[PDB]
Amino acid sequence: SLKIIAPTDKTITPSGTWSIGARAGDFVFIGGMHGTDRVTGKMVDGDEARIRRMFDNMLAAAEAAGATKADAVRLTVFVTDVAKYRPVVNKVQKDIWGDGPYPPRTVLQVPALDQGDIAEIDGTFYAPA
Amino acid sequence: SLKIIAPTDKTITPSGTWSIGARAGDFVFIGGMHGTDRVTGKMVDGDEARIRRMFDNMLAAAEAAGATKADAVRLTVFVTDVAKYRPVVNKVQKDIWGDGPYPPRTVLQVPALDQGDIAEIDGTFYA
Amino acid sequence: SLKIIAPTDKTITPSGTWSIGARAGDFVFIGGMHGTDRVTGKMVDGDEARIRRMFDNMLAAAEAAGATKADAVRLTVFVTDVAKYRPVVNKVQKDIWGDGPYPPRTVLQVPALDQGDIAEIDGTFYAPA
């Protein structure tokens, strides 16, 4: 059976009809994450701070199920202006992953997000026990 | 190997180049579902009911492969107006999952779906 | 654990903060694919030719990892105009999959994709060794 990932003091705290993610055997599915502060639930200022924080939130949920950034098998980034934020996502991923290797990834533009945010991400990880 | 989930009296019937979903080892991958009637292909009337049909469709298909709502590891819900429909989604989810627990999800706005619908869901499950 | 799919003489060459795809246990995840020429990275001319190309790149990557079109457990197709392109996709899927059986899929309109392309695809595959 899946195990829903319980919220942690490093992690988002779900405030509605959802979970932060689930462990399912070897796989870990993180729900949509965005650049909110875990404590207040409010969005962080700054384009790059926002996106870095979206990644950190996602990675925390993952790490709370035993997956690391090196276990990512798919990232789906939805943003609000691909022309504008694709380079930011690039820059933030260079910060996190260094020179690689990088996970498979898809970046799409979309009209509206959780809360009017600029970016939301879906992460799926493979982390055998 | 994977096994394509074959249509059912509880299930939607595929009308083109796709399947309802597939079982792959321990997992179940349901393709996109709209809030339509399994028997007519007409989009069921009215917001609340439509969004509930969507889930009920998705969940029948999951059921055809031996997956229950308690098995959802991902829901991706695309809607045509997020401000107007997440409340409806949130509400349909409470009806189905009660107080808890709930699957991971992501809810996005998309400018169009096939045949001018308001909502579409992608579900992934673990048995 | 996870195995990044390395570029190939049949395959696209990553050039940015991503990989063509990954194999994890029994599954293969391919990142976003466009209808570009594997060698030049230029987008192919022609609606149908392009959507054919997009598909062909996705499967070339999936094969580099031991998966065939008969292994497809989910296709998510992001297009710029559902009305003008659902049919093109149906046609291309006929040409490739013949009478089937066809994979589970979803087709979405989306205001923009990177590079200004009209379509992009996400394939997930199941191919136990």
UniProtKB/TrEMBL annotation, chain B:
Record keyword Disulfide bond present: no
Swiss-Prot/TrEMBL keywords = Signal
Q: Which GO terms describe its cellular component?
A: cytosol
- GO molecular function terms here? deaminase activity
Answer whether the UniProt record assigns the keyword Repressor to this protein. no
Q: Where are the transmembrane segments?
A: none
Protein name in the entry: Possible translation initiation inhibitor
Species assigned in the record: Rhodopseudomonas palustris (strain ATCC BAA-98 / CGA009)
